[PDB]
Design a protein around this ligand. Sequence first.
Ligand code: HEC
Ligand code: HEC
Ligand code: HEC
Ligand code: HEC
Ligand code: HEC
Ligand code: HEC
Ligand code: HEC
Ligand code: HEC
Ligand code: HEC
Ligand code: HEC
Ligand code: HEC
Ligand code: HEC
Ligand code: HEC
Ligand code: HEC
Ligand SMILES: O=N[O-]
Ligand SMILES: O=N[O-]
Ligand SMILES: [Ca+2]
Ligand SMILES: [Ca+2]
Ligand SMILES: [Ca+2]
Ligand SMILES: [Ca+2]
Lengths: 75, 520, 520, 74
Amino acid sequence: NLKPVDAMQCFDCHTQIEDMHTVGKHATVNCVHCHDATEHVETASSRRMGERPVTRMDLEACATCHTAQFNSFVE
Amino acid sequence: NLKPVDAMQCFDCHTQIEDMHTVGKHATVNCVHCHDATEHVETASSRRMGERPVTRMDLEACATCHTAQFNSFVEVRHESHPRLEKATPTSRSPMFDKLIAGHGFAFEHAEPRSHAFMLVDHFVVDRAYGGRFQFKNWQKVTDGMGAVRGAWTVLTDADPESSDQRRFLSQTATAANPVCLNCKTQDHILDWAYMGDEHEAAKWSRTSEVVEFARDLNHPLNCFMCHDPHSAGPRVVRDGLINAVVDRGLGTYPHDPVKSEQQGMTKVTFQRGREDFRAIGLLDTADSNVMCAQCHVEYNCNPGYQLSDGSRVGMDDRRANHFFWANVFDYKEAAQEIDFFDFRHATTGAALPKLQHPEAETFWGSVHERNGVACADCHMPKVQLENGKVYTSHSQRTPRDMMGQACLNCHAEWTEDQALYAIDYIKNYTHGKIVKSEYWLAKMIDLFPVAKRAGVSEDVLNQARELHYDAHLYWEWWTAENSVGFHNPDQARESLMTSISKSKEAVSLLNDAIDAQVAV
Amino acid sequence: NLKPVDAMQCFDCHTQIEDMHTVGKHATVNCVHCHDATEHVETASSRRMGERPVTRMDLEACATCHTAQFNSFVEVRHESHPRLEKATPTSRSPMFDKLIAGHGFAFEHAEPRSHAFMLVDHFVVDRAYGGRFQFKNWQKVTDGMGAVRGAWTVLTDADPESSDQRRFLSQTATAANPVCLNCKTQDHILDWAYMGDEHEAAKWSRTSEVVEFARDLNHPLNCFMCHDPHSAGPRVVRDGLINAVVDRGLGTYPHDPVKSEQQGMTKVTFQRGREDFRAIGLLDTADSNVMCAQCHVEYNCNPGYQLSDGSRVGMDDRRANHFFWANVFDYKEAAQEIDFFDFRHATTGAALPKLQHPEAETFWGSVHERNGVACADCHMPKVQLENGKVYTSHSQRTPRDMMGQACLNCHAEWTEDQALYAIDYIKNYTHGKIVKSEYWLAKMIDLFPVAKRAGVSEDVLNQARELHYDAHLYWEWWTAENSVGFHNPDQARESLMTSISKSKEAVSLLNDAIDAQVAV
Amino acid sequence: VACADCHMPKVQLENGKVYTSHSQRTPRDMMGQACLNCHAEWTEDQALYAIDYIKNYTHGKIVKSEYWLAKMID
Ligand code: HEC
Ligand code: HEC
Ligand code: HEC
Ligand code: HEC
Ligand code: HEC
Ligand code: HEC
Ligand code: HEC
Ligand code: HEC
Ligand code: HEC
Ligand code: HEC
Ligand code: HEC
Ligand code: HEC
Ligand code: HEC
Ligand code: HEC
Ligand SMILES: O=N[O-]
Ligand SMILES: O=N[O-]
Ligand SMILES: [Ca+2]
Ligand SMILES: [Ca+2]
Ligand SMILES: [Ca+2]
Ligand SMILES: [Ca+2]
């Protein structure tokens, strides 16, 4: 089961994502739905990536909340 | 656009919610999807609510992330005939008017139709609110999506200025009361104490004015009746069911102690001012037999009378909200256990039970139930896709519409036509016995006025009234139950043969007494 | 091959015909298409007919230039079940035999079928001519075109040598009389004086021997019943309708003085020997509500009795040919106005009305009528063609067969299945109330013999007979009317609830009186 | 008009929450939602006939263009 991450802590270094995320229709969608950043957050500074976080590119990352669009697409 | 709130701030006070939310599959779903709590957070203390937060009860709160399940749920099955009266020769109970005379169902009792309409159909049926509520016009009867959006977007009230139950047309009744609504909506889930007891924190209770209550309610069969919105895990919310299964210790499967243990229910209680207020029952498994048993059971939800002394039992008594949780052969004993009956027959004067849609108790012990089959396997199966993410159909309907997924997947030896023929064999046989039971009930009922007028003694008439109770129970179970015997064909046959035996016994008693009177 | 005659020569005498023919859309259609008048022209004077010209009344006189309308008209709808008795559990009136006992309809009353058969069905029904007329064999029942060509090309007469009405089989009646034919054919249009009064120039009248009249008639529903053959403009020819609308000044829409003015009727009278003989009513507009109201109304067309003194009213009285032109809630007053009832119930002895197919009076005041919708919009719409000259369908039938043209063109928000579901909701609800009304009527009727035999007083039985009149009227309207409530659902519901109230009142009166007798 | 209007239109439901079809395919599979909603004067067969008139004419000219290119190449 996914556990949400502290998005505010992300935004301390990710102002460009903050300005898009906080304002659009995914403002309540937690980063854990598409990113595995635990080791990244442990090692990064605002000027040094540290460990590369993982980003999901699979279409199933969207299909959990948008099954109808996904199922229509894969027909 | 929604902005998330800080859940940790809520959890500071709401430790039960924290324990459920952080662990289940809604751990990432923010409170703002369903609650507006800004002023609440500013004013609450750890034990006092302060300003009341807003909670969304509409089904579209879930449709945003679960559109497939929502769209499947709101589908209207047009082949399920609407407003179709059961008391006619071509429906379930050709002699219902004679047999049920004295009870409010005589005013109108239609076959069920799609779930989207449950709350609007409750409001407009002729037996419920004296004809007070109507669809805004006769075209709105088709609008399933509209009804789901809210009953009051499709209905009118003949008199918004009064809140008394009264007849607005001559052939209506005012049988509705607050308990009914528990099987039509759970919009009142935060405003109703467990069982509908009087409670300082409850706006509504068993003794409320039902017209005022009605006006506060909007949505049919809320998604959260079966799914905990915080953990997303399987549950029931219906107080009458939790009371039978948990408080009375009868278990989820009263005939099967083992299955009851493997597929059990945990009562969770929520308080107001540190006093118990409302409860839910979390299920060990996603068990649709118990989920659908929130409503598809025999119940009391009405005033009635005591078997011992004939005195009135009102809405204020706990018996006015009761799940018997008994099969047809244990029912008479279950009604003796609470000392209760529903009405006196208008012609025979007999004390009689009123039975309602007992699908859950009928299904117990059937071949399918004993093999671990559940309502959803036949009535809301997984969708089959050539390419796609599988989900569960939420359009609860006859398996005739999806025989590939509801039957033929387990019955590989049959074609669709053979499976349909097997269903019809049972339904045809069962309906023939229901019709014969009604014929014998009517013959008995017709003799009561003849016997009374011939001067037959009260003692003989009372013996016949005692037979009427049983003849009625063992018949009405099956016109009330919706599968026409399919859910338990051997039980239907044994019960309907018992009804006929009881009527024949009563007919013989009355004919002999009438003949003796005439001979003197 | 036809040769034209000189119309100007006709017009020298026939100035009314000249005024109509020269101005309308048949100005180019020569008289020879419908009349053979050679010997007539040689012998007539300006006031004496001389030799009678031949006039074609067959529908093929119009089919030559209007084949599409004719072919559409003669279509047989095989899905409209033929010879289907209404007094059965699966049809319109399961308890009709008990309720109508004493009236000729008890012998046979089938559902309507396609218009092509109206005259042959009139001749062969068991209640009409004692079983005298039959199809030549049981295969001819399918032959719509044959019936249109002429009733006598498909029927036989069991006794051509006699012309009396008598029973040829035991369970028949001889209810037919000359007035009936006015709603089956207008072949007699030149041989029948207005209203069927005795008249020197009329071969047939209300008092004719109906078997002899029958033998002169051939064609169903002539095209000229709605279309003036001379002007081609819209009209009615039915005397009973003209009498209500014009002579009694009630108007085409009795509830709407304005619409009656915009969509009115002008009575035109034709003379014989300079005395009034026959009449037609020219319509201001092609208004199918009024055209179909030539037949689809409640009427008297039969002998009966006076409400005031019980005396016989025979075919000779004008009341034997009468359009009440009243909705169900004004009907009792309309029957008091002419001091008339139809029959005495065989079991209760009550004076009762007999109601017939009152579609036109039911439709008044409905949502559709109030919005300017007319019968033809739902029952004979324009044909829709990808490429072609549009014409009006003349196959009058349920809109279920052409939902695109009859409903969905106005109701763009609905699919066909949703529109059908809306119709069925009303029909299901209405039929349930008809069945409940019958149940209460039967319960009352069953008490009359018990009450009589217990020695209940004439005064109480007469009070119950007065209730029977109303219980009957408010029920029978709806088994007679063919839409099962669809034409006016609110009115059906209010009326059927009134019927039930009246029966319940009668049942309570009789039960209390029987019980008092037994107590003494 | 845009590609999605003919190739991924909104779903039409008697009862339900509208969403956009993401099955990008010929409008022949959903003519009600992809053409006939704007072309009320047409039946489905008439709209299909109009498409085929264009495709048939165009394909004839493609074939003739290939015939002449091939002749030049040879
Ligand atoms: C799936 C629904 C996602 C959610 C929720 C979040 N992110 Fe994301 N992110 C996603 C994808 C598919 C990509 C690849 C780039 C693209 O534009 O599609 C990304 C990328 C980022 C990046 C890299 C941006 C760059 O510099 O190239 C960052 C820094 C990032 N995402 C951060 C982030 C944070 C902090 C979120 C929680 C508030 C978050 N994302 C949500 C997919 C998804
Ligand atoms: C649940 C945790 C979600 C995941 C994972 C994704 N999305 Fe989403 N999306 C979600 C919500 C609650 C909403 C708002 C719904 C509303 O109408 O209020 C959305 C919205 C969209 C939209 C519409 C945006 C608009 O401006 O109209 C799109 C196009 C969308 N979402 C796409 C999308 C994609 C491509 C995802 C995978 C990267 C995805 N979403 C993830 C909930 C959730
Ligand atoms: C998006 C912001 C959501 C809203 C609003 C609701 N739910 Fe949800 N749900 C969501 C996600 C991302 C998941 C997990 C997907 C996965 O499989 O990992 C869920 C899961 C469910 C489940 C399944 C739970 C289980 O199998 O244990 C149910 C039954 C469920 N959700 C129901 C539900 C209801 C009834 C809602 C309205 C009260 C609702 N959800 C809102 C995302 C979102
Ligand atoms: C109380 C909130 C209910 C729960 C939980 C379930 N059902 Fe139900 N059902 C309910 C009502 C009040 C009605 C009649 C609605 C009306 O407006 O008439 C129904 C109807 C059905 C039907 C008939 C549907 C049809 O097409 O005619 C079926 C097959 C049905 N119900 C099945 C069902 C199953 C399988 C459930 C558990 C998954 C279930 N219902 C829950 C009330 C309630
Ligand atoms: C749950 C234990 C219920 C209580 C309490 C009430 N009803 Fe109900 N109702 C229930 C189910 C499962 C169904 C569908 C199955 C069926 O056999 O009908 C229904 C159906 C209705 C309907 C539609 C059918 C009809 O009888 O016309 C109406 C109008 C209805 N219910 C009304 C109603 C009233 C007035 C109640 C309190 C007196 C009431 N219901 C209680 C489940 C439950
Ligand atoms: C009880 C009568 C239910 C109501 C009301 C709702 N759902 Fe349901 N849901 C139900 C069952 C029996 C199941 C299958 C559980 C199993 O594992 O067999 C489901 C499943 C879900 C899921 C999970 C994904 C899936 O299987 O489709 C989701 C997201 C879900 N249901 C959502 C949902 C929504 C949004 C509802 C209101 C429209 C809804 N459910 C009502 C039982 C019941
Ligand atoms: C398959 C093995 C079934 C299981 C498990 C359940 N039901 Fe059922 N039901 C079944 C059949 C074959 C029929 C007759 C349907 C037909 O079209 O002939 C039924 C009927 C119903 C109905 C009435 C549905 C209708 O005809 O529209 C209801 C309300 C219903 N069943 C409910 C129900 C519940 C609540 C169950 C679990 C306790 C249940 N059914 C189990 C097949 C099967
Ligand atoms: C051909 C020699 C004809 C015969 C025989 C009949 N009709 Fe006719 N009709 C004819 C023509 C050329 C026209 C005019 C066509 C036009 O639109 O200009 C008509 C018109 C009618 C109409 C329409 C009248 C109107 O809209 O005002 C009707 C209703 C009509 N005709 C009916 C009719 C009937 C009932 C006939 C048999 C008695 C008949 N027509 C004979 C040509 C011919
Ligand atoms: C008297 C000459 C009539 C006129 C004018 C109209 N109708 Fe009629 N209709 C009439 C009879 C005697 C019958 C029954 C015929 C039989 O043999 O049983 C009918 C029947 C209909 C029906 C039922 C058709 C079916 O398929 O069952 C319809 C829908 C009907 N009638 C409609 C109708 C309309 C709309 C009219 C005006 C355009 C109309 N009728 C005129 C007698 C007469
Ligand atoms: C016009 C005012 C009528 C008079 C006078 C008569 N009938 Fe009729 N009939 C009429 C209509 C509009 C219909 C179809 C609608 C319906 O409800 O039936 C009929 C139908 C018949 C039928 C077929 C149906 C049936 O009852 O079996 C028969 C056999 C029939 N009509 C006979 C009949 C007789 C014997 C009449 C004089 C006593 C008579 N009709 C008068 C319209 C009118
Ligand atoms: C009344 C019950 C009618 C009978 C009998 C006949 N027709 Fe008719 N016709 C009728 C109506 C209501 C209409 C439409 C008028 C409008 O403007 O809406 C028609 C129309 C015609 C026309 C005009 C061209 C067309 O619209 O199709 C013609 C030529 C016509 N009708 C001919 C016709 C014939 C030949 C008939 C006997 C088979 C016939 N009509 C009978 C009403 C009635
Ligand atoms: C549409 C708005 C209608 C108008 C205007 C009229 N009628 Fe009608 N009628 C209508 C429906 C939906 C139905 C039920 C048909 C079904 O298949 O359920 C009817 C029924 C009739 C019938 C019986 C037809 C049959 O079932 O075969 C008759 C004889 C009939 N209607 C006659 C009639 C007349 C004479 C009208 C004008 C006064 C009239 N109808 C108006 C729909 C509509
Ligand atoms: C409707 C007015 C259209 C718009 C806007 C777009 N296209 Fe289209 N496309 C259209 C038709 C009638 C056809 C022929 C389909 C047939 O079955 O005959 C097409 C074809 C395509 C195809 C090939 C599809 C196939 O035959 O399977 C593609 C790849 C396609 N079109 C893409 C496309 C794009 C990217 C558009 C926006 C730039 C676009 N189309 C617009 C109708 C319409
Ligand atoms: C471009 C080729 C697209 C890809 C890849 C995906 N989607 Fe889409 N989406 C697209 C358009 C043109 C639209 C409609 C925009 C409009 O308003 O007309 C959409 C819409 C959505 C929505 C919004 C709700 C709805 O309209 O259905 C959602 C949630 C959405 N799309 C999700 C989605 C998912 C999960 C995808 C991967 C399977 C996906 N989209 C791909 C264009 C494109
Ligand atoms: O009937 N009063 O709620
Ligand atoms: O019944 N004689 O016409
Ligand atoms: Ca049903
Ligand atoms: Ca009960
Ligand atoms: Ca018919
Ligand atoms: Ca009459």
